[PDB]
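Writing this down once: the sequence line spells out the residues, with the fold written below as integer tokens. I am pasting one below:
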Amino acid sequence: SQEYTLIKIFVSNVKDFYSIFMNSIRSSQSVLNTFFTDFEKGEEDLKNKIWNEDFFVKDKKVIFLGSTLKPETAYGQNYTFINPNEYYYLTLGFDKQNIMTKEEIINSCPNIYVCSENSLYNLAYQGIIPLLKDVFILNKIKGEHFVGLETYTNISKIKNLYILPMTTIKMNISTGIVPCVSSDSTDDYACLEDIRKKKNYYCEKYNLKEEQLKNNSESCIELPEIGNNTGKYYYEKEKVSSYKDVKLQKIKEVLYKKQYFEGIMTVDPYKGMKTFNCRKLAKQNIIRNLDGFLYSE
């Protein structure tokens, strides 16, 4: 049972998120002339409350639930990765970690979470989302539609963390949304490098512009005799060919263990602390500050 740290990844432009939301509602009503929980006969006021700009701008926070095994690197986050080819679910949940009626969920849950199907019942077991009297689904949206949205966390140095596509995200692991920390992760580095290299493919295919692809990731971890920016260092040394290179999984596992046992933190509030210790503190601080959750499956 692997423990993950979920980080609250807030959406900057909630009105654009609302456009995406209503575009999806309309598409699904058209095709079905499984995307959202149906509204019952006397629930029109609920429908009118949810399908409303106020719901996304005033009433609720819109939050992608990012999953990481390296929470100590969150200050360096430069992008948010999503699987563009898979469906993500929108569901209401709690800000702090529950069989409830639709009305009760609307009245009690301040956050709209975006996450994979895989995560849903795990989240409910963790007390992060309620069960409906079986999960209340506001929408189901392919990841491609979120590519280019601006996100941020309360930990990240920068606040323009665009959503980028990563097709190697496995839908059976956690929430299927991951923080991009390109300085400190070879897979993140690899994916960002492929996007940059094939910027014409990516900006043609998705709602992405060249100028969005230049965000720096502040390295949080130095390795003795290597230095910082270890993601790039192992990308280059192991001759990684792309973010879909079969050897990455092993490189990712080796680098994870090496940073954990040997890394030194290079960012506030952890400067000079060993990564081994910081892993635990960062989990503590993130949870205590209500910036995220512990999650198991």
Observations:
- The radius of gyration is 19 Å.
- The longest strand covers residues 3-11.
